[PDB]
Design a protein around this ligand. Sequence first.
Ligand SMILES: CCCCCCCC
Ligand SMILES: CCCCC
Length: 205
Amino acid sequence: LAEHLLKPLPADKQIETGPFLEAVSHLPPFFDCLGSPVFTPIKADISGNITKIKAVYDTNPAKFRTLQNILEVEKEMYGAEWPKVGATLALMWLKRGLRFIQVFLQSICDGERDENHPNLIRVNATKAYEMALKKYHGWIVQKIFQAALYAAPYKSDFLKALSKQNVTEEECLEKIRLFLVNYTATIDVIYEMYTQMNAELNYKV
Ligand SMILES: CCCCCCCC
Ligand SMILES: CCCCC
């Protein structure tokens, strides 16, 4: 996780597209080791969105040099169908997935737990879901999340699995905290960009 740290934000707070995509492309493969095929569709959404942004980038790397470039170029390119199109739509959903992971990991690191059930991660996942995704899901997908939550491993197994090497839980969590610095900062900047460009949509799925 901290082997693929995101770069820091530059002074102008512009996020270069290519390095950003390389960095977040290391996140999906962790889903293969949470111990359930319930996570396969989740990996596909995140990866699928990464792939969609990459494919738009590849058609003109200079024009789409930054994430900001993408939104303003596509706004101009598409007119009325924007922002519900292209890389802008893919990144709208990617950000919510990345924020989910962010909120989840930070909750874990901050020592949040169910006193009654200390070695589960359900309360952590549930907070992340409420903060990042829930308001954009209709009742059917929300019910599916509630089912999928039971596929979550134990906290100990989860942390040990990320340490995939010979390291204490405390050490592992300090590495996660390190990863979270630039990760959170970058996602914040993407969320701010959506707000300023008025590119955020609230439709539910
Ligand atoms: C550099 C971006 C590569 C696209 C990978 C898509 C799956 C995470
Ligand atoms: C990349 C780890 C994801 C946990 C939700």
